[PDB]
Structures are given as structure tokens and as C-alpha cells.
């Protein structure tokens, strides 16, 4: 029977490969708490965790008891079209007045400094890593494409490539017809020469 | 829950007709199929036998066909060994 597996727990087979843990791939052998919990030792982290856990338990109990024993004076029922499962989202994602524009601008600047540029650099590294993986004679890397490839839009390509090509082809067609007819028969319009 | 219930103990349905058979012959398609069958049974079949009754004591005067002339009795000297082994028709 060979090596029979026991239990149907997860194995990284061809169909299932799982969700990569980039945090462990990057932070290999380096602790995460220097970045997530700056300036704290393990004992302080544990003490803080226990304190916050008890506080959160108390707050949750109070909130549940509050919601469970409150009289109802108003009933709110949102308006939805029949055949709709949930109401539309009342919220919006567009700044309306100038103050919201300033707030959105500040948030975007922070996010660009801390979230978007890291994403861009990680994606660039990923592209280059894939190129290196498909190199060395395994894949078709370097056969075509690159930074020197000339990329044209649809309009530009049709106008500056396709039409002149067809124009030259038409010129070639007429010229070849005339020159071939003269080449064989020897006359442009009188069929065979010296025969008619 | 599963439809197996009605597989095991299907409902029993009351009919006004004396039998299910008649109930199925109030549908136009079955009536027209029965009409086609009756037409075929009535006209041709009864007629055909009538003819063998009407011409029971009369001969067949059709002129026989001409298959093989005498001068072609050898069939042009063509091999005719059938796969059975002898130059005779399977019949």
C-alpha cells in the first residue's frame, strides 16, 4: 500500500496551492513586533494584551446588555424597490464641498507616501522577478517586447501604417499587371506581337 | 422533503370516467392518430383482400421478362465462382 496518508488535511497538490504568506516570506527570521509594537518587550506586550482583553470583555458585556434591554420609541425601515434584497448604500465616495476636497487631498497624500508607492515598487519587483524566472533558456523572454517597442494606439496605427501599406500595394498591383502583360504578349493592348 | 416521498406513496387521483383509457381519448392528437390508423385499416386493408376475393379464379397474364439470350449463355466467359464454393446463387 506504500505510504498512505492519514486524515484529509490540506496538502499543496496541483489543484490547491494555498494563499501565500508574503509577511512571513519577507520578515523571515525577523520579528514583527519591532514594527507593529515599537519599543515594547515581550512581557509588556503580554501584559498590555491581557489588560486590553479584560477591558474589551467588560465593554462588550455592557454594550450587549444595553442593546438587549432598551425600549423602542422609533422604528426605521429603509425604502427599497420590490425584487431588491438590500437597500442601496446611502454613502458616497466623492467629495462634495471644498472642505471634503481638502480632507480627501490630505488623505491621498498620506496614502501615496505610505500605501501606493510601496505597492508600485512591489509590483515592479514582481514583474522583474517573473522575467528572471522565465529566463536562462526556459521561456521566451527577450524574444519580443521591451522598453524600445513602439506601441501605437488604434487610430494612430491604422492611419500611419495600414493605409500607406495598402496604397503601396495598389500601386504594385497596377504596375505589375501592366508590366506582366507587356512581358508575355509583348504589346500593352494588342495581344501577341507579330501574330495579330 | 426529498421527492422520494411521492416516489414511494404517490397520490391517487379521482376521475369521472369509468377508466383512464377513455380519459386519454378526449385529446385531439390521440383521436387524430386513431383516425389515421382507422383510415389505413378500413380503406386499403379491406380493399386489398376484396381484390383477392374478386380475382380469386383468374390467372396472372403478365408477360415474363427476358433476362438471358441464348447467344449469351456463357456470360462472355466471365468467372462466376461465388465465395461459397460453387457457381450457384445463394438463394
Amino acid at each position: 500500500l506504500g505510504h498512505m496518508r492519514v486524515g484529509a488535511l490540506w496538502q499543496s497538490n496541483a489543484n490547491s496551492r494555498g494563499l501565500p504568506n508574503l509577511l512571513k516570506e519577507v520578515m523571515a527570521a525577523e520579528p514583527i513586533y519591532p514594527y507593529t509594537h515599537p519599543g515594547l518587550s515581550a512581557k509588556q506586550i503580554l501584559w498590555n494584551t491581557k489588560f486590553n482583553l479584560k477591558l474589551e470583555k467588560d465593554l462588550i458585556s455592557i454594550a450587549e446588555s444595553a442593546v438587549q434591554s432598551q425600549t423602542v420609541n422609533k422604528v426605521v425601515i429603509p425604502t427599497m424597490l420590490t425584487g431588491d434584497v438590500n437597500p442601496k448604500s446611502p454613502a458616497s465616495v466623492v467629495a462634495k464641498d471644498k472642505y471634503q476636497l481638502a480632507k480627501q487631498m490630505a488623505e491621498f497624500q498620506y496614502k501615496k507616501s505610505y500605501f501606493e508607492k510601496p505597492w508600485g515598487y512591489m509590483f515592479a519587483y514582481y514583474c522583474d522577478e517573473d522575467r528572471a524566472r522565465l529566463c536562462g533558456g526556459i521561456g521566451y523572454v527577450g524574444h519580443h517586447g521591451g522598453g524600445d517597442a513602439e506601441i501605437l494606439s488604434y487610430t494612430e496605427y491604422v492611419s500611419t501604417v495600414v493605409y500607406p501599406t495598402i496604397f503601396y500595394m495598389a500601386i504594385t498591383f497596377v504596375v505589375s499587371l501592366f508590366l506582366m502583360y507587356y512581358y508575355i504578349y509583348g504589346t500593352f493592348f494588342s495581344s501577341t506581337r507579330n501574330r495579330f | 422533503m426529498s421527492t422520494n416521498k411521492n416516489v414511494f406513496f404517490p397520490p391517487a387521483l379521482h376521475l369521472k370516467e369509468n377508466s383512464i383509457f377513455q380519459y386519454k381519448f378526449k385529446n385531439l392528437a390521440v383521436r387524430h392518430d386513431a383516425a389515421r390508423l382507422g383510415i389505413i385499416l378500413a380503406g386499403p386493408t379491406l380493399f386489398y383482400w376484396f381484390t383477392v376475393y374478386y380475382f380469386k379464379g383468374m390467372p396472372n397474364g403478365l408477360p415474363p421478362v427476358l433476362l438471358n439470350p441464348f447467344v449469351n449463355r456463357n456470360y462472355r466467359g466471365q468467372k462466376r465462382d461465388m465465395p461459397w464454393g460453387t457457381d450457384c446463387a445463394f438463394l
Binding site: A42, K43, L46, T49, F51, L53, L55, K57, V85, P90 | -
Partner: protein
Amino acid sequence: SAWNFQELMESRIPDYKGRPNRSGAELEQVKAALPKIEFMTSYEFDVLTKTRSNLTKEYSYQRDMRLKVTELMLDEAPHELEGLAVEGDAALKQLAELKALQTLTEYAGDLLEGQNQIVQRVNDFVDSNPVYLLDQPLREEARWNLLPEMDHKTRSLVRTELRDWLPAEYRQTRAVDLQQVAAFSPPVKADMFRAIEARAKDAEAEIRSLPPAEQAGLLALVKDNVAKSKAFIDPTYDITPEAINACNDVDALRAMAHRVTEYSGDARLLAIYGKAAQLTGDTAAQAILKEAKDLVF
């Protein structure tokens, strides 16, 4: 008729008709029967139904599982973080302890994900076989229709019954929002603050019963935790009527009005806007505020 190329169900094309046609009599009867209705601006519904504290919208049982796993992991921390030995100074020992703690939490984190996956699989089973988990007459409506296509009443009854089929600890109900309940009720906010202060005081005593360096470190941590907890429950606990009265800046009152509108939009808006109008002499604004305090609040 000699061939049959059917399917399980013909595709169902919805008929639209339109909005109901009610004459004067029917419209009059409908209007008479309906209660007193206060039509709410979409902003009111938004601030009511925002996602504030329950960021990931986790169900109650998921939160309970996470807290229990945290308790268990805390219980087992001393064993793992005991007897660690590594060549190096205090910093190397500290980083070794941090790494051991990270390994423990990752070990405990993977168990929580496994249990969540198991409960979610049980629920996936619940919705996978509704015909076998419902009584008449809802069983036929579950058999012949999908969720979107059901009648509203039958849809709601079917979903509630399916959820009730599960044990108590597998039912999927969104967890409570602490910030939400605090925002929409004064007494609960005061109770939460009192509880925060009581826990902080108890922890401060416990700290006072410890050797010196730990005392300073954990006191700093307690102060930071109290400040951030107060911010978490209600970011606008410093916008008090006294603060509004002491404020004499149009820009500051505008910022306070923004922050109150974001949070709850309660009568502090009336106070701030009244004071801003007084400093600016806006009779139309004062009239609108009078209307608001008569009707809105």
C-alpha cells in the same frame, strides 16, 4: 412530441408592469391607515448604519472565538517564554523573546483560522441543502426559487428558519458596534467611560504592586491605553457645551461641526451652529436652527 429536449427549468423572464394604480378612494384609504411617518434624510440613515468599530463585520461567534483564543494564548505564553537562552546582550535576549512570542501567536493564529473555516463550512452546508432543513410551506418555496427571486415575506421567513436550524454558537449575526451604541445613547457612553476608568485604576494598583522599572513602563502603557480607548469609544468627547462656549473662532466651530456631523449629528450641532450664527449674525440660519430644534431634535 417524439423528441423531448427539455431542461430542469425554463428560464424565467420577469414581467414588470409598473407602480401600482390607485384611484382617489384607494389612495385616501392608504393615507388614512398609515402611521405618522418621519421621512429621514439619507445622511441620517448613513450615520445610523455606518461601520464604525466592527471594521471587518465579524459575527458574534467569530469575535467570541477570537477572544477565547487570545485568553488561551495568554495562558500558555509564560511556558514558551520561559528558559530562553541565547548568546548576546539584553537586546538579543529581548529580540529572542519577541521571536518566541511571534511564533506562539502564529501558532495560535492558525488554529483560529481553522475553527473559522470549520464553522463557515457548516454554514455552507446549511444553505446547500435548504430542502432538507425546512418545514411546509416554506420547503416548496425553497425548492422552486432562489434567494433573489423569492417573495419578500417568504424570503425572510426562509432565511430566519435556516439560521435558527443551527446551534446557538453557529448562528451568523453581526457583532455589536461599541462606538455605534455609544454614539446613539448618552448613558451607555458614560457607563463605558466609567468602566474604562475603573479598569485603568485596578491596573494601576496592580502595577503599584510590582518592582520599579515595570511600574514606569506599564504606567506609560496604561496612560496610552486609556487615551486611545477614550478616542476609540467616542472621538468627540472633548466637544462639550463648555468647550463650544469657550470657543470664539469661526474656523474652529466649523471643524467641530464637521467632527460632530461625522460622529452622531446630535444637538451639539444646534449649539455649535447657534454660536456660529451669533458670531456672524445670520438671521436665516437662526430661523432654520429654530425650525430644527422644533422638529429635527
